[PDB]
Amino acid sequence: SNMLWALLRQYVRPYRWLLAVVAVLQVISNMASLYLPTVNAAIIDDGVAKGDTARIVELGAVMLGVTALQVVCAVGAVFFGARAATGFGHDLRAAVFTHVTTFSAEEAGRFGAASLLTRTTNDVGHIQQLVQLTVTMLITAPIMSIGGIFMALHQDAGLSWLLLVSVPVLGLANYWIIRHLMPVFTRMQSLIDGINRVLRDQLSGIRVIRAFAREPLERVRFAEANQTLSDSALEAGRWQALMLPVTTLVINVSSVALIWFGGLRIDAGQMQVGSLIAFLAYFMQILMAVLMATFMLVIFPRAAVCADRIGEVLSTQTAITNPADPVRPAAIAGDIGVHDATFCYPGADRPVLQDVSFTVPRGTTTAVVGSTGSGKSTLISLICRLYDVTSGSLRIDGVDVRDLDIEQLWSAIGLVPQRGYLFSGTVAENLRYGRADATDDEMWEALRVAAAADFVRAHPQGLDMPVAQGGINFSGGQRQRLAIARAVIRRPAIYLFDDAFSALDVHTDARVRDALREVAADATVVIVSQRISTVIEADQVVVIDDGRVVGIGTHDTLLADCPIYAEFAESQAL
Amino acid sequence: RTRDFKGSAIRLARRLLPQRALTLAVILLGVGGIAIGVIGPRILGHATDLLFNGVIGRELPAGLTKEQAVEAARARGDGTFADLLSGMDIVPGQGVDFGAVGRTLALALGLYLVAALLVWVQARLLNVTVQRTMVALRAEVQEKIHRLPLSYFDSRQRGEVLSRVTNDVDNIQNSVSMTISQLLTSVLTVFAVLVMMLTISPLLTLFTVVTVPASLWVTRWITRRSQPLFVAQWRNTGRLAAHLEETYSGFTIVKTFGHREAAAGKFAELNSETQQSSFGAQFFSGLVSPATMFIGNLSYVAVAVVGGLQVATGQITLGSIQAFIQYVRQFNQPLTQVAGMYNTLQSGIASAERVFDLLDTEEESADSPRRADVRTGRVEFEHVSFSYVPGTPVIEDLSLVAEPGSTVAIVGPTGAGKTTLVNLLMRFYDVDSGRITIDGVDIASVSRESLRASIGMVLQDTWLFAGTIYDNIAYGRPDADEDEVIEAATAAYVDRFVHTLPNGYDTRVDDDGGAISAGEKQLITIARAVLARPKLLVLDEATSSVDTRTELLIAHAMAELRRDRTSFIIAHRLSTIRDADLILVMDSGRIIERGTHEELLARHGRYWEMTRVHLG
Ligand SMILES: Nc1ncnc2c1ncn2[C@@H]1O[C@H](COP(=O)(O)OP(=O)(O)OP(=O)(O)O)[C@@H](O)[C@H]1O
Ligand SMILES: Nc1ncnc2c1ncn2[C@@H]1O[C@H](COP(=O)(O)OP(=O)(O)O)[C@@H](O)[C@H]1O
Ligand SMILES: [Mg+2]
Ligand SMILES: [Mg+2]
Incomplete structure (x- = not known):
């Protein structure tokens, strides 16, 4: 939301150069996994399609090289991602603590001492765990897609239009679902937290609930929390039911249009038969990236409620401040004078x-x-x-x-x-x-x-x-x-x-x-x-x-x- | 823990029994969605193999046969290309025959368009049957809490029963829809996608299932070599959170006495010491995905090379290695989630027998319909001999009498059994060997709902639920207008401190700024009990955190100037108990001495030497 972004762009600002390195190692580590099916297409075309047996092993060697490069810059990416994601969070709870310790008794008591504690450690942690996971496991979906477009443009730039028509319709039909899902999902989380509140209040006072004979009034106060939670959890899961079918249907229809519009070129002599083995893998890797990137976007709403608490603390301005030119007696020897x-x-x-x-x-x-x-x-x-x-x-x-x-x-x-x-x-x-x-x-x-x-x-x-x-x-x-x-x-x-x-x-x-x-x-x-x-x-x-x-x-x-x-x-x- | 796994499993699985139609139409509707993502690549490889047959089968001399073409290839020094031609249903001269390609791709498209309908309808029917056994599980836990005796709730640990109705019911849901949705299909896409690629090549499926051992061993070597990093990061955040907890709780003592800098420099140490120890554990816990994808790409270099070295020899077809590559990415996809979708099922069925033991523990004693009637109110105990745990008396041969229009005042040490006596009057616990009669009728033959409502208590510890002060007071009698609630809020002296709150009567008890003191939560609780107009009023030290002069006014106006109310006042400050007719002095379970203030004072007993500890 508004506060999760103003916080994330302020405290992850000193690590821009650790993020420009993760974002150039994820590119390499994804283009090197989009390049294994290209060299497989080269095997199919310069190997299988010829006799040329030695060209398969002396080109699977080039493939082992690529699969080693793909891992030496996928641990190098998580190394710097886990450093930027901890520097952010160090600097965030340092800021929350340094701001809290300027409060007065009233301003500190307004938040509490436990709500103010679980707002600087395990509340900065839910944004630290957001940065970590959006820089190592979520930028791959927009990188695998664009990199697959560039790989499909490198190889057979004539059938590349299928991946300029399938990635937009996949990031749009999956943006629609998420745009309708985020509200019905952030309402379900304030409604799981309420049913639990009801249970906590019923178990804490199970003795005075009975002293007044309020078990009829209760479990009508719980039957409304249970049923409302289920009503909001059953429409949040009818949008979450379209995510996998729609994305896999887009990938599979693109895959069956691939072989038609590619065989029309393979017959025409303007495409090699191995360029289908490559495009299918481009699609099936874009699919695996988009799936596991959209199946862990549940942490944005739970860490945008967390970033509202931190912003509520950080936006609190103290009102009791040491004056500009304070008087400094030789010794304050008490004589208290409460006047009016x-x-x-x-x-x-x-x-x-x-x-x-x-x-x-x-x-x-x-x-x-x-x-x-x-x-x-x-x-x-x-x-x-x-x-x-x-x-x-x-x-x-x-x-x-x-x-x-x-x-x-x-x-x-x-x-x-x-x-x-x-x-x-x-x-x-x-x-x-x-x-x-x-x-x-x-x-x-x-x-x-x-x-x-x-x-x-x-x-x-x-x-x-x-x-x-x-x-x-x-x-x-x-x-x-x-x-x-x-x-x-x-x-x-x-x-x-x-x-x-x-x-x-x-x-x-x-x-x-x-x-x-x-x-x-x-x-x-x-x-x-x-x-x-x-x-x-x-x-x-x-x-x-x-x-x-x-x-x-x-x-x-x-x-x-x-x-x-x-x-x-x-x-x-x- | 988890003292059994078979009975609990077969009992949780038939909680999905009321609607077995929805549970059977999710299983067979997911089988038909798996038998298509397996037969999809195999139909699509036939289409891609119709292309290759016509592409390297139209350059051959038209008029020859498949055998003569292979012979000519052998003759002109092509040992491998001739094997390629031999293991390939070609015909020299013909093209692609886009009729067959079109029909194959139309089948693949119309059969991919159905598999995304059987999966949508499955995810929709799986969400109805799961969010329906939870609404029925979580709703019989509720009706269980109101049937258990009080001896079940205060003999358990503090958060035990809480995180068994709220966290163990969240793990049953995440295990009832994880094992019919994510692990019933990711076992079919491991058996079927594997039996389908034993039919393509049993040599290539050997290079694929030897990344189950290698990718389960290294995801077990990393998570036991980064074990000394999760125990230098849980106890290193637990020191930061303990410093913060005491610098926030003693904030006016940190602030005063000057130790802001000494507490901010210790935070700079504990904070740049949990950064270093969290990086070290978040790097090694994060290089488990880059390591399970290196082994997954080494089994792709092996398949692409060998099975491509095996197509060039004519053993398998180019369309069957395209299918096989589709299966390599479809097989080891449900093999990077098996740890999660099994530990969740483990601690989703462990915390699915706690709930069932809670639902099987014995309920209370099936009360009577008698509907207690109290017009005057004359409490009387007759040789009450209660005990919590057998062999340790808590009340021994106790006997008191109320006199309908009176206020008997129970004093004594801590542990004398003063609160236990209220747990017996309210029938929270059953009396052992003795009668307890209100207005003549034994309370043991009475509907508890009518006894508890013809009485009314305020205990020393206060309960306030999540709401405003107005709601927490009107909880004593909901069908009361705003004026009758503020009238009871004035007799309990909560109207005094509620106009000094920013939004009085609407200030939330769960969301205040520490505005409500601990003695002010006792006043809101006294107002809640005086709003119901109880005939028998018991004040069990519910006025102990307030002024001793607000206490003398409450237990003046509510107890001694109410000629039409019998009332017990269990108090610790026994200077508000004087001039309160019939003080009962208890000790170690029984009433030592009794009488009014002057009678009990001028007889030199325990009360005489208790009225002279606050006065020397
Ligand atoms: N943080 C707060 N925000 C709003 N109102 C508050 C807050 N703290 C206290 N109040 C209100 O202001 C009043 C301050 O009373 P105060 O705490 O000074 O009484 P006190 O004499 O300390 O009481 P006691 O004798 O119980 O200690 C209280 O009635 C309380 O309802
Ligand atoms: N729920 C319980 N289970 C077991 N023992 C209890 C329980 N409640 C109280 N007791 C014990 O029995 C005695 C009862 O005293 P109590 O009712 O607390 O009187 P008072 O309120 O005057 O302390 C206490 O000494 C306490 O240790
Ligand atoms: Mg007590
Ligand atoms: Mg005070």
């Missing part, structure tokens, strides 16, 4: 945050508290420009956050998000990640601070106990204490905890926070939590509900002043 900040996803009815306006001092700790989906994690991501404000301002020390180099900001902030992630390797590699040159008496110090030193010292390999890919070999309370620890080997100015203490009991939560505001007593801490016990000793607590700030104060002066806060602390029996 709102945030609304494009098209929504209600903004996530609306008219939020508060301020956390240089060496204090604020705590924002609210319900689910009330805008707490959206505020953390606004403080450190993972998201970008729409109608307000985020300031740190007095300078707008949109007016700072986004990389110096992140270097001053220690972030612990809700969806935390530990990277595979070593626990001393997951916290050699906030500092990158930490010693061991710093790693153990901050593992003590995060109350994580026990389960990492109680291990043979020391602070080298291997972590799985997602940090899955730990419990929640260990996985989110390593995440707090690697934010403590940074010594930031601004700590941003986003539900960082939810899988910890009140005891270890209080331990971690005591050890935190004892070694980082001069840093600005912002705690996002639904639990009130981790908010009791905050210097100020703000409550947000439906986006708006309902109340600001401390645990005591807000337990009476804010109805939502009192109702919130009453649901926990304080």
Whole structure:
């Protein structure tokens, strides 16, 4: 389609000279297989037609030479084809990765992390496998045809018109079928993918499908997918049923017209009898090329849907960019100044945050508290420009956050998000990640601070106990204490905890926070939590509900002043 | 695997039994299309041999006979041309006789015009009979899934039953139309095209069938010498896809902390290390076609030379070597596909017995027509003693009572058997040695369709199918107007976060931008169960990923201010369970202690020391 071609002509552009070599070796390797029946015609005419027995062996020698040349440039063609087809695909997933890693949190979350993974490896692969196979196994159909025309023009240029009337009518009657087949075939593929979706959703929720007694509603929702799939797969196979019969009928009618219009010349003394043995093989090789080239065009529609995903990624332009002349203070020593900040996803009815306006001092700790989906994690991501404000301002020390180099900001902030992630390797590699040159008496110090030193010292390999890919070999309370620890080997100015203490009991939560505001007593801490016990000793607590700030104060002066806060602390029996 | 091959084969092959007319008219209609592509070159060689007879038979002196011409040729020192003339039905003086050429070519044309009709009609009748046994196979798998007990789905592996109804039914189709279409005809065009060229020359068909061994040996030498290249390219793309998976999943931790360059340079390594290892495996896997066509052209140089050395001696005719060359390209054409059209039939009949074992596994227990009636609703267990696997009790001598207008609240550790108790109330599993009565009638003598609909549950894990939020909520009661769906969407507090979505109530659950949280999928699931107006409502920790204050409002408005609804609330945060009349405290299968909040609190039991773990 439009995006499969604009992608294929951009990323296979540096290998034009590896393609001009495959396209000159396929020509030689096809003209050398169209030349074996010519030397066979020479055997039939200078050999058989004479006595001349030696002329058959001393001309089958010329034929072994040609059949060796035909293979020394058919592996040389796949050698360069498999190099161009991997350079394309190297350069394509390099581009997809380099573009994805410029996205923001919103733009990366819009695609996902798995739909964004199977869009750079096994989705670049379906176009890599298209280039490979269209340069080594599909250009032979248009090369065998044109080369057969030139061979039929070399030998007996008078009966060559049969191959100028049979190749057009074969690439036209086979273009008609494919032009009517491509739509009914690309609809069948979005309809196989739907019936499977139905089965996946029925097997995943076979328990709630029954809790509601929806097996009548189901299997009427599946009987429409099954029957529609069969209706689109049965008309896609009535066009695919004309492909072989029509092409073989064209070749066979051309073959039976060959002997008539060629015997009319052989009687007239203007054609040798061996020139039929040659033309028949020209036709029967053009046939074998066209058949196996049209029987593997099913990869163009499946790799033009694949190239739509890659183009959708590559056409996404980021919106959060490091400004032109960013302000660069001597040291970002946190003082957060949310002024009238709102945030609304494009098209929504209600903004996530609306008219939020508060301020956390240089060496204090604020705590924002609210319900689910009330805008707490959206505020953390606004403080450190993972998201970008729409109608307000985020300031740190007095300078707008949109007016700072986004990389110096992140270097001053220690972030612990809700969806935390530990990277595979070593626990001393997951916290050699906030500092990158930490010693061991710093790693153990901050593992003590995060109350994580026990389960990492109680291990043979020391602070080298291997972590799985997602940090899955730990419990929640260990996985989110390593995440707090690697934010403590940074010594930031601004700590941003986003539900960082939810899988910890009140005891270890209080331990971690005591050890935190004892070694980082001069840093600005912002705690996002639904639990009130981790908010009791905050210097100020703000409550947000439906986006708006309902109340600001401390645990005591807000337990009476804010109805939502009192109702919130009453649901926990304080 | 594939514990049998005979029974599964004879059972799959008679799945093509309902329409045996279409299956018999595809086989005999393909036999008549093979007996013509074999007799076509042989008729066409007769036409090309009528030409050669008249061309090198009109230069001879007119008036002589075939014997005298051969004698004269021998006499004037032509040992080979005289043999040519001898093994050739000629007559000295006559021309081509285009009457015979015209009749032969008219037969060949009218018989090539029929073979392309018997193949079109075959491919059309083969597509009707295949896309008709699949619509009937894939449609009794569907009716099987709704008959199996829940003990079949959660005792299997994760993707096991999924990729047995969706990938094994795609391999049965690609094996039901591969072996009546591509390997029933490519065995006839190997037996017939071979018996036809044992009649032309048994010496030349020996130079052709000795490229089955040579072309099956080298397509087995290359694919075991490029085996250490598929295991340096599957584990070298599996490291790239593992780096990408963690640099995309921890993207706000790669982004923050500055490690964009350290993660982009590791990608530059893993990417120019899967290029080198994929080229090496895609070259050697690709030089198997240039190698099966070199051996195929060496058996063409051999035929063209020897059989052309054999026409010049008069042993065979020029028209029978043209036919034979047609057969050389028609014989070893279905010999560069035998690997595929046999491994597909192997793993198309292996994954055709999985499905048949799925279609033969025992169904559930043939329910009753009683149609449970619940007007008040008084649940009561009586010495329930369920166990999943024998010898390991999961519930032991349990007995509770509901009081129609109440809300009993089940708390306890993880593994106490709280969810299992809901699988017993919903009759997902059958109780062992004990009664379970809703409103008086044993639920074991009740149509499950009417029991499950007079109840309603929300489990801790949520199911949402591929659609909008509106559809996923209206799934609880489809015959409900837009207002009654938004009314249940408001009591479950999903109307709160749905106006902050770009297109609320139309935002697809399978195609959002991470817009729907994990606790918000639990709210959409609570709205789905309150839309059906259940009389018995069970909330099995379906409010565990949300605020503990949205939880106290949901299980206030839906459970405690509904005087006309009995409701179980299985909760982990037991601070929303207080002031909820009759807390039941379970442990290791049985109810240790019970009562209201104050009774159970001022008796110093397990509940007393559980209400004091979140408060020191
Ligand atoms: N990628 C997205 N696209 C569109 N809408 C989104 C996206 N992510 C979140 N939202 C919506 O915006 C709101 C943001 O809520 P947010 O995640 O800040 O709440 P929260 O306080 O983090 O909730 P919790 O306490 O459960 O963590 C949510 O209600 C959600 O529905
Ligand atoms: N489908 C099952 N098959 C076998 N054992 C199970 C199954 N479901 C649960 N169990 C086991 O039986 C016990 C039942 O507890 P469960 O119903 O999960 O209560 P809870 O939800 O409170 O953990 C658990 O300890 C679990 O290990
Ligand atoms: Mg959040
Ligand atoms: Mg449970």
